[PDB]
Design a binder for these strands. Structure first.
Lengths: 96, 121, 81, 129, 94, 87, 216, 206, 25
RNA sequence: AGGGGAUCGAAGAUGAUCAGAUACCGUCGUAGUCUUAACCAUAAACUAUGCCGACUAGGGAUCGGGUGGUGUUUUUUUAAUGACCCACUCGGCACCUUACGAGAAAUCAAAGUCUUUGGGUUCUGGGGGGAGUAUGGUCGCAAGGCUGAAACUUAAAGGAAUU
């Protein structure tokens, strides 16, 4: 019977078992639990302004050798300390 | 080791394939005959080819061996293909004119061919 | 065999199969008539009696209980009914 | 235990066809199975079935010609409407030209094409092709 | 991956048996799993019977033989060369 | 297959096995075609006339090819009492 | 020069067998790539890709190239062949020969109006090679071959104008899904559509009637 | 049908039962062999010699159906039928593979032993499984001298006979040669017995 | 690490955490 | 918590070997190993394969019961019974050969009858770590059992086979 109920009057069992089994999905848990509104630094936003506290420099991970020239910026709304990344070459001079 | 190479092995068998009587049962007499028969560029090579050939010439005298095919092998077995036993060819013989059978075998006889000599055991 | 008659089995095939595996379900038992010595007093006895049958006239064992077919007494005669 | 009689009968028929056998012993017995065999006979997917009668359910022996490919049951018996016939035939049949979805309806047991012409619909039994 | 149909050794339908002890290293092994070799060797060594016979009271006729059953663990049986590994095709051979 | 005007589309209408009706595939390199010579009165075969029997690869692999062939031979009259329907 | 060895090669060279249909109908084994090209002169080649295969040895690898080549004309015939070789061009040359030797025909059909010419497949046919499955559902006119570009090209050389496709498994393995698709278009004639139900006399094998031009 | 002159004559019946051809094997018996007729108390299963004759003449018609008498191939790996195949390959045409049969005579098209037959006649299918296996790939009917216990895989025509005996194997080959020669049209009347001794196909111990 | 030794280590660590727990609660 | 406590023997005490050895090896040795009464609810507790039902390639051996064969042997040569031989049947622990069929393969008479997808039903899993951890409940004298996350981190782990 493929391990699933197959009666014409057995729909609650499939509906319930679907409800628990979809919780294993990463997207299903991420959306319904609403962790983006609690633990995400951006708080469910595409952009976030902040204040440049200091200029930062980090080293690359294995098989690589560079300093990424990052920056530590405190978001305004949340007030959390968040590291950012200045993308283009020679762009730290613009920021301060 | 004295293991002969396949080159002298195959050529020697080919020599006896078409030349039974030419290779005599002695080494020296047919050693030069092998040179006269096959194009051999080395005196050493024809010496070993005749040595194996003479040794094979001795073994065939004792009896047939594998891979002989000497144009005379069929001569005996084409003569020895007509054994044809004169009378007792396992038919109407080996008994007192009656075939020894069993009870179940008799029921097979009474099926369609009951007109036969039977001897139920 | 791909082409065989499951609808008209031969006598040998039906006699070999179990009573529950034949073309039609039927018993394999039978009823026997046993007579005590001297008096006739015919009585019917099952093949698997499961008990010790006695003719009400004479207190004599006519068969002994057995897991398979019932074993009739030596001083008895049996006939198919 | 034994839940459906037609499911076992059709499975045995399919197994016999896969084994190159021209016969199969159907032994859950039913009237739906008999009617399911009659509609198969109407399109020539089987030969002749004769029902052995004991004082129990019964047995059926159907002679199979080498024309049937697959016969199955659709359990549970879904409440297919008259507009869902095309959807079922588009998921249980290889091609639209042949193949017959055998469904039970208030006018009896028959196939999908006859249901369209009679303009009636019922429960879906299975499929034959 | 699976190696043998009988996983450990000769046990289908029991589930548990009383274990035995190896005679070499005293390893605890299941009775079925243990590899048993029977020793039928004579009480005397190879030859030397003729020396015994000359110094034998009564018309000899004794020649006793000691009988013993030995249980070997997998590690000891392989190490003692009693049981040797085989190819996959030879593994199925009994 | 045919279209509306009636001319026969689809090519090489395939053969079928003589024991269990099944299309013999083009790459089914296990099906042989049995040919049986026809005798006439004098007991000599007549070249050119054959009794064509076809057996699919599946039947041959099962080992029922011999059983099927005698059934067809007995049905067509080639053999007399080598098969029994009521086995 | 060909100097064929097989009986079929002698027959086709002499001009006795003039159609590939007779060999398909009689299931006559053939291993001679002259036979296939002579009977099917419009026969084309299309290689998907070349994937090297490496075997490790005591000192370095033994890189060899594996090529997949499709052989088939767009009117009912198609063939596939895979061969490994040290040189990529040699693998392609050998792949053409094998694909020629493995030419299979196609049973086209319709989604259905019984009106024009066979465009789609007659029934639903699938083939499995390893873990990949390829389903070929018939499609209405004008739908086209909706599938991966590799199998779309293979089906376009098979003569199919429109079809539906479903795949399950690691479809990224091109060789497996090509063979699985090849089996799918190989089982089309296997299906017994009710039109092919009438009994027909068994044709006598061409070799039996042409045994005079065989051997010696 | 047949002119009814091919029925088992008492002379042929006497010969067949003299070589113990009817004597089959013990309880080992495949379900694909219904030719067995009762069973002796010892355990030997008796083969109906009548069914062998109709199967023998059916094979003869099949062999005679071959137009050119070289596509017929007789193969034998057992030493008890080597001479029978050789004599059968010299009296009724056909090519012999008596002795070792190399793996590839039927499939490898560049070998020195490559032949393209239309009919293969093996002696022991169990001992000639390689020949049957290759014959399956190239669409060739197989005729085998099978017993009750011998496998019937890829065997289209069976000849019920005893394979564990020189007498039975030689007799079946002798009878098969007799029937096929009469069908070809070289053995004149079908009533006169063949002028060669049946022991010619037999194999001597040396 | 082995499963047994890892489980024993985390069990001893759990025992230590619970012993610290019993001091406050 | 009592009885019992001979061998083996978590701890521990020594003898060594070893650069180090409170490990492997040797000699002692407590708890324990046995049992009574009450708890603990765990295992590679595995056939790593849930239960019920139907169908499908053959072959032999074996366990329990039954049937038949003037079958063999046995006591009083010969009745019974019993023990064996042959044939058959039902339920079993299983096994040998093939692979229609399935599977990624190793392999499987099911792990087959699943893209030709549907016999009935229960439980579990959704990349690898964190983690069976933290907390909250619940059971237990305790050791521990059941339910059971998140933050964070990574582009790999993992399975079967080839050289």
């Amino acid at each position: 019977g493929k391990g699933k109920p197959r009666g014409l009057n057995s729909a609650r069992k499939l509906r319930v078992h679907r409800r628990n089994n979809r919780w294993a999905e990463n997207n299903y848990k991420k959306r319904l639990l609403g962790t983006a509104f609690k633990s995400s630094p951006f708080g469910g936003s595409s952009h976030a302004k902040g204040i440049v506290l200091e200029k930062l420099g980090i080293e690359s991970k294995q098989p690589n050798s560079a300093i990424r020239k990052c920056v530590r910026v405190q978001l305004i709304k949340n007030g959390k300390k968040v590291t950012a990344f200045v993308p283009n070459d020679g762009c730290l001079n613009f920021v301060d | 080791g004295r293991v002969r190479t396949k080159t002298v092995k195959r050529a020697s068998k080919a020599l006896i394939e078409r030349y039974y009587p030419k290779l005599t049962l002695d080494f020296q007499t047919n050693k030069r005959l092998c040179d006269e028969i096959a194009t051999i560029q080395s005196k050493r090579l024809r010496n070993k080819i005749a040595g194996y050939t003479t040794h094979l010439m001795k073994r065939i005298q004792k009896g047939p061996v594998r891979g002989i095919s000497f144009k005379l092998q069929e001569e005996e077995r084409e003569r020895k293909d007509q054994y044809v036993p004169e009378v007792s060819a396992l038919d109407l013989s080996r008994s007192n004119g009656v075939l020894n059978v069993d009870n179940q075998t008799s029921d097979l006889v009474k099926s369609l061919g009951l007109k036969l000599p039977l001897s139920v055991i | 065999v791909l082409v065989q008659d499951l609808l008209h089995p031969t006598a040998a095939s039906e006699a070999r199969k179990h009573k529950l595996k034949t073309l039609v379900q039927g018993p394999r038992s039978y009823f026997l008539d046993v007579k005590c010595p001297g008096c006739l007093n015919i009585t019917t006895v099952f093949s698997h009696a499961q008990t010790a049958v006695t003719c009400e006239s004479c207190s004599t064992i006519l068969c002994t209980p057995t897991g398979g077919k019932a074993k009739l007494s030596e001083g008895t005669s049996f006939r198919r009914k | 235990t034994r839940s459906s009689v037609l499911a076992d009968a059709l499975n045995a028929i399919n197994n016999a066809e896969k084994t190159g056998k021209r016969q199969v012993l159907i032994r859950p017995s039913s009237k739906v199975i008999i009617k399911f065999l009659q509609v198969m006979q109407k399109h020539g997917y089987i030969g002749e079935f004769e029902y052995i009668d004991d004082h129990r359910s019964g047995k059926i022996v159907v002679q199979l010609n080498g024309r049937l490919n697959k016969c199955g049951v659709i359990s549970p018996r879904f409440n297919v409407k008259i507009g869902d016939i095309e959807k079922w035939t588009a998921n249980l049949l290889p091609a639209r030209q042949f193949g017959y979805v055998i469904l039970t309806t208030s006018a009896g047991i028959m196939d999908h094409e006859e249901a369209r012409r009679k303009h009636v619909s019922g429960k879906i039994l299975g499929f034959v092709y | 991956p699976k190696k043998r149909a009988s996983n450990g050794r000769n046990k289908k339908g029991r589930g548990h048996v009383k274990p035995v002890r190896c005679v070499n290293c005293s390893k605890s092994i299941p009775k079925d799993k243990a590899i048993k070799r029977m020793a039928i060797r004579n009480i005397v060594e190879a030859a030397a019977v003729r020396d015994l016979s000359e110094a034998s009271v009564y018309p000899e006729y004794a020649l006793p033989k000691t009988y013993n059953k030995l249980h070997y663990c997998v590690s000891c049986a392989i190490h003692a060369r009693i049981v040797r590994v085989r190819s996959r095709e030879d593994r199925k051979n009994r | 297959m045919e279209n509306d005007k009636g001319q026969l589309v689809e090519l090489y209408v395939p053969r079928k096995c003589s024991a269990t009706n099944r299309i013999i595939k083009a790459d089914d390199h296990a099906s042989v075609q049995i040919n049986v010579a026809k005798v006439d009165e004098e007991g000599r075969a007549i070249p050119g006339e054959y009794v064509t029997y076809a057996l699919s690869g599946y039947v041959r692999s099962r080992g029922e090819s011999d059983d099927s062939l005698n059934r067809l031979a007995q049905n067509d009259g080639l053999l007399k009492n080598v098969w029994s329907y009521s086995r | 020069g060909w100097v064929p060895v097989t009986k079929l090669g002698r027959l086709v060279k002499a001009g006795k067998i003039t159609t590939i249909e007779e060999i398909f109908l009689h299931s006559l084994p053939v291993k001679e790539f002259q036979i296939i090209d002579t009977l099917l002169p419009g026969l084309q080649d299309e290689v998907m890709n070349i994937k090297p295969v490496q075997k490790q040895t005591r000192a370095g690898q033994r890189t060899r190239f594996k090529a997949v080549v499709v052989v088939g004309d767009s009117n009912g015939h198609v063939g596939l062949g895979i061969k490994t070789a040290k040189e990529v061009a040699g693998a392609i040359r050998a792949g053409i020969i094998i694909a020629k030797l493995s030419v299979i025909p196609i049973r086209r059909g319709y989604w259905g109006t019984n009106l024009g010419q066979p465009h789609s497949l007659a029934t639903k046919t699938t083939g499995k090679c390893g873990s990949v499955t390829v389903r070929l559902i018939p499609a209405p006119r004008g739908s086209g071959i909706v599938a991966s570009p590799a199998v779309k090209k293979l089906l376009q050389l098979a003569g199919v104008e429109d079809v539906y496709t479903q795949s399950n498994g690691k479809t990224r393995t091109l060789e497996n899904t090509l063979k699985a698709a090849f089996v799918a278009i190989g089982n089309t004639y296997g299906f017994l559509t009710p039109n092919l139900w009438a009994e027909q006399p068994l044709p006598v094998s061409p070799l039996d009637i042409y045994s005079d031009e065989a051997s010696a | 049908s047949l002119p009814a002159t091919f029925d088992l004559t008492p002379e042929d019946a006497q010969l067949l039962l003299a070589a113990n051809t009817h004597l089959g094997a013990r309880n080992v018996q495949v379900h694909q062999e219904p030719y067995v007729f009762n069973a002796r108390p010892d355990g030997v299963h008796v083969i109906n010699v009548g069914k062998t004759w109709e199967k023998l003449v059916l094979a003869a018609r099949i062999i005679a159906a071959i137009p050119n008498p070289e596509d017929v191939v007789a193969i034998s790996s057992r030493t008890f039928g080597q001479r029978a195949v050789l004599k059968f390959a010299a009296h009724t045409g056909a090519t012999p593979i008596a002795g070792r049969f190399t793996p590839g005579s039927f499939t490898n098209y560049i070998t020195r032993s490559f032949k393209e037959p239309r009919l293969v006649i093996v002696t022991d299918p169990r001992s000639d499984a390689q020949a049957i296996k290759e014959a399956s790939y190239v669409n060739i009917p197989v005729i085998a001298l099978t017993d009750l216990d011998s496998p019937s895989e890829f065997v289209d025509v069976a000849i019920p006979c005893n394979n564990r005996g020189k007498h039975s194997i030689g007799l079946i080959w002798y009878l098969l040669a007799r029937e096929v020669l009469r069908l070809r049209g070289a053995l004149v009347d079908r009533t006169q017995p063949w002028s060669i001794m049946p022991d010619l196909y037999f194999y001597r111990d040396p | 690490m082995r499963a047994k030794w890892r489980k024993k280590r985390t069990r001893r660590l759990k025992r230590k955490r619970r012993k610290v727990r019993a001091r406050s609660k």
